[PDB]
Design an enzyme around this catalytic site. Sequence first.
Site, PDB file in Angstrom:
ATOM      1  N   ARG A 151       0.822  -1.206   0.000  1.00 19.01           N
ATOM      2  CA  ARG A 151       0.000   0.000   0.000  1.00 19.01           C
ATOM      3  C   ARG A 151       0.859   1.261   0.000  1.00 19.01           C
ATOM      4  NH1 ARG A 151      -3.585  -3.644   0.598  1.00 19.01           N
ATOM      5  NH2 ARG A 151      -5.819  -3.186   0.798  1.00 19.01           N
ATOM      6  N   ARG A 255     -10.973  -9.157  -0.289  1.00 18.75           N
ATOM      7  CA  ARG A 255     -12.010  -9.399  -1.286  1.00 18.75           C
ATOM      8  C   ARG A 255     -12.707 -10.733  -1.048  1.00 18.75           C
ATOM      9  NH1 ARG A 255     -10.768 -10.695  -7.593  1.00 18.75           N
ATOM     10  NH2 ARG A 255     -12.930 -10.906  -8.313  1.00 18.75           N
ATOM     11  N   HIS A 327      -5.259 -17.527 -18.705  1.00 20.65           N
ATOM     12  CA  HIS A 327      -6.359 -17.209 -17.809  1.00 20.65           C
ATOM     13  C   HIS A 327      -7.658 -17.702 -18.436  1.00 20.65           C
ATOM     14  CE1 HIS A 327      -4.914 -14.234 -14.597  1.00 20.65           C
ATOM     15  NE2 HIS A 327      -3.827 -14.755 -15.137  1.00 20.65           N
ATOM     16  N   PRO A 328      -8.568 -18.293 -17.659  1.00 21.59           N
ATOM     17  CA  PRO A 328      -9.776 -18.876 -18.258  1.00 21.59           C
ATOM     18  C   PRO A 328     -10.656 -17.827 -18.918  1.00 21.59           C
ATOM     19  CG  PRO A 328      -9.417 -19.679 -16.015  1.00 21.59           C
ATOM     20  CD  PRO A 328      -8.505 -18.513 -16.207  1.00 21.59           C
ATOM     21  N   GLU A 357     -16.393 -22.058 -18.330  1.00 20.88           N
ATOM     22  CA  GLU A 357     -15.988 -21.537 -19.663  1.00 20.88           C
ATOM     23  C   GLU A 357     -16.967 -22.028 -20.735  1.00 20.88           C
ATOM     24  OE1 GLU A 357     -13.702 -19.081 -19.847  1.00 20.88           O
ATOM     25  OE2 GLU A 357     -13.917 -19.431 -17.689  1.00 20.88           O
ATOM     26  N   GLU A 384     -21.066 -14.012 -16.666  1.00 19.14           N
ATOM     27  CA  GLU A 384     -20.375 -14.762 -15.582  1.00 19.14           C
ATOM     28  C   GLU A 384     -21.393 -15.588 -14.786  1.00 19.14           C
ATOM     29  OE1 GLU A 384     -17.192 -14.266 -15.992  1.00 19.14           O
ATOM     30  OE2 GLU A 384     -16.202 -15.225 -14.281  1.00 19.14           O
ATOM     31  N   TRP A 459     -13.474   6.557   3.870  1.00 19.11           N
ATOM     32  CA  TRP A 459     -13.392   5.175   3.407  1.00 19.11           C
ATOM     33  C   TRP A 459     -13.237   4.213   4.581  1.00 19.11           C
ATOM     34  CZ3 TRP A 459      -8.788   1.995   1.598  1.00 19.11           C
ATOM     35  CH2 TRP A 459      -9.210   0.904   0.827  1.00 19.11           C
ATOM     36  N   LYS A 463     -15.747   1.353   6.196  1.00 27.50           N
ATOM     37  CA  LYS A 463     -15.277  -0.017   6.389  1.00 27.50           C
ATOM     38  C   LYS A 463     -15.518  -0.493   7.816  1.00 27.50           C
ATOM     39  CE  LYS A 463     -11.536   0.614   4.105  1.00 27.50           C
ATOM     40  NZ  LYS A 463     -10.070   0.494   3.961  1.00 27.50           N
ATOM     41  N   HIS A 487      -9.302  -3.766 -10.248  1.00 26.63           N
ATOM     42  CA  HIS A 487     -10.462  -3.126 -10.860  1.00 26.63           C
ATOM     43  C   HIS A 487     -10.443  -1.615 -10.663  1.00 26.63           C
ATOM     44  CE1 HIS A 487     -11.060  -6.978  -8.835  1.00 26.63           C
ATOM     45  NE2 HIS A 487     -11.734  -7.378  -9.898  1.00 26.63           N
ATOM     46  N   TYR A 497     -20.114  -7.715  -9.457  1.00 27.96           N
ATOM     47  CA  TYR A 497     -20.039  -8.959  -8.698  1.00 27.96           C
ATOM     48  C   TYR A 497     -21.249  -9.135  -7.786  1.00 27.96           C
ATOM     49  CZ  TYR A 497     -15.274  -9.257 -10.438  1.00 27.96           C
ATOM     50  OH  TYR A 497     -14.168  -9.340 -11.253  1.00 27.96           O
TER      51      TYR A 497
HETATM   52 CL   LIG Z   1     -16.089   2.166   1.611  1.00 25.11          CL
END
Ligand SMILES: [Cl-]
Lengths: 597, 96
Positions: A151, A255, A327-328, A357, A384, A459, A463, A487, A497
């Site tokens: 970071r 994630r 990568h698939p 796939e 997806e 932020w 969180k 991303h 997602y």
């Molecule tokens: Cl956030």
Amino acid sequence: STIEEQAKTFLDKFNHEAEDLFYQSSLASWNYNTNITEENVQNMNNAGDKWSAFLKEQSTLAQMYPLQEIQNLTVKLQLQALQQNGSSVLSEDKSKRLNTILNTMSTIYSTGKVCNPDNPQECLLLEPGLNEIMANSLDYNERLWAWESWRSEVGKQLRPLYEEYVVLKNEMARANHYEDYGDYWRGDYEVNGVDGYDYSRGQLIEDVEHTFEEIKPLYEHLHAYVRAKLMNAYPSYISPIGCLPAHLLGDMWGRFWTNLYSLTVPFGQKPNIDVTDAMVDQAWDAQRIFKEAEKFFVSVGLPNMTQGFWENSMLTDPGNVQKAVCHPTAWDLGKGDFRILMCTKVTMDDFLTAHHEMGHIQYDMAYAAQPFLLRNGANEGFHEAVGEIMSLSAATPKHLKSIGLLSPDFQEDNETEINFLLKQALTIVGTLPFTYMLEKWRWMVFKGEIPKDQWMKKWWEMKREIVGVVEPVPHDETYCDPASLFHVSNDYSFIRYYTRTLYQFQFQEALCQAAKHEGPLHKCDISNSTEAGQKLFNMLRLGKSEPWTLALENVVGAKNMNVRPLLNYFEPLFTWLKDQNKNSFVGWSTDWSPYAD
Amino acid sequence: NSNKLDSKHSGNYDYWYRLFRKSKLKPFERDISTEIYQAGNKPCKGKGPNCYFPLQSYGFRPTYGVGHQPYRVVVLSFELLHAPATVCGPKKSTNL
Ligand SMILES: [Cl-]
Ligand SMILES: *[C@@H]1O[C@H](CO)[C@@H](O)[C@H](O)[C@H]1NC(C)=O
Ligand SMILES: *[C@@H]1O[C@H](CO)[C@@H](O)[C@H](O)[C@H]1NC(C)=O
Ligand SMILES: *[C@@H]1O[C@H](CO)[C@@H](O)[C@H](O)[C@H]1NC(C)=O
Ligand SMILES: *[C@@H]1O[C@H](CO)[C@@H](O)[C@H](O)[C@H]1NC(C)=O
């Protein structure tokens, strides 16, 4: 006479020219990605330059049609998709500055290196190095150092550049009649001119907030269970009520919680489902894997597969003479040419990845008759999800027993299904609050609601309040830690997602109801049912020429995202986990921090 | 179905078909037209904004769907009109 007919003629010309141009571009990409040389890079650069020039030329030539004089929906959709100039509305100077800053984002993220404080010449990249460091090492100090070094090395470089990126994107969005870049991104789910199926831009925010509200309790119970397991593992680092540290979530940013499985395994002694021994014993190879998935797809009645895929696609790593990036990915080169690329190994993970796939290929092939400008999913989140629902279906032990990979003497019990559901929750439940908060925070940044000098503070406040994650070492405003993600730093939406998670489970519930299954949602199988295949095809053929609401209703009968399938699938998990959480505190305190003593 | 002779990679751009004509055709008619279409009002010359070239191409490749597959079609026509027949079916018989 009318302008509509001229638009029809223009789109007729554009479709037939763009088919060939996109085919050549995708063939160059296909011969580069599998087969890495230096001349293939030049061939792809030329093909992509031609494709981009063609797109710009067509947009400029078709901008002279005003959209107020179009009647039938089909054309209006094609022209709206074509007319979006994107960055070309902005002046050339700021547009080129934007492309350079994007290139620097890519270079810094891909080539970012961190060196250990004991050896200046020994430095590690993220995916080769830090990924393994935070995915395998159980040492607290090493994970802390990886988090902080990565970071502190990326965010300080990326902060002002991300600031100017946001400024330029907001200006371009305001040029394109959008209040902010968040609105530009949200416009993907926008539709108009269809009664009973309309969708507004703030409607997306409203429904996602409501869905997160209804999904919150299971996430909080899972958070309590994971925190209990972590204090069992790490007594001196985690408070019974405070939030979990960021670098204890299994990956680089929290994630996915898939890694922490061993920490929260209910019966470490109960055997886990794995059939790699079955493949090595039966001498299974890639061809048999893909034939098995072929017959799995045939079982529901889907269209049986073509010759060129089997003849020309590489189903295996091309040795050591030629190196491939595998990568698939499912490739739709256009004009009926469908292809696959992934280095196939004899593993169950590769089995599910192959099923995913093939699901993408099935979707791509379903709308092959749709025109060039509309050959895509009803929205971004249908590709997806359709790929993952097939992998979910194939992972059922009933299918493994049916196809002779799992012994019939295997005894399914409550503990095994609880273990499997905990695995699925750690991969799925963990990422939903992260996706929601990340996309939402960027939306406020794009809206400009949060002044520059408290981006990081707000932020982290979000969180600790909603995700239950607290930083271990304090950070000031010079960091750009959100940009440390693939991303965020490379111009991709993240909400995809959350919508995919909702959609895949909605589809699973609908198809399982159509399949007449008498058993737990997680045991459901969709083979044996040509009715389910026909129901899937009824939306597979649609593409996106019609509103996504109609496509969703054609499968589930609902015109909006709903959370009932997700809660119904995890209901036994929910009741077992609430049984566990009777002796543990539910919720988290935002005040406690690891660096605060 | 002809998928081996009338098919090629890199696209087959040799076969044509016509999508624009002033009116309906009459049975068994040949029309090699080269004029440019007209919509309803313009004294257009050449390939105008409302005046297009009325020929397209049958883009063919061997990885196409069955519904779009380039089928080979030949039609046989007979006439049952009273006249001396010159073509007829064969017939054969037994030994003596
Ligand atoms: Cl956030
Ligand atoms: C190797 O590169 C050549 C260059 O065009 C390509 O034709 C061939 O398919 C590649 N080999 C693969 C993709 O296995
Ligand atoms: C749109 O085109 C379809 C298909 O030709 C036709 O059935 C329909 O009536 C048209 N609708 C409008 C509003 O023109
Ligand atoms: C081909 O697909 C159809 C359904 O589209 C199915 O009835 C048939 O069984 C498939 N072919 C084979 C060999 O299974
Ligand atoms: C399996 O096959 C037959 C189809 O008639 C029947 O026993 C049963 O309905 C099928 N299973 C499911 C879940 O449809």
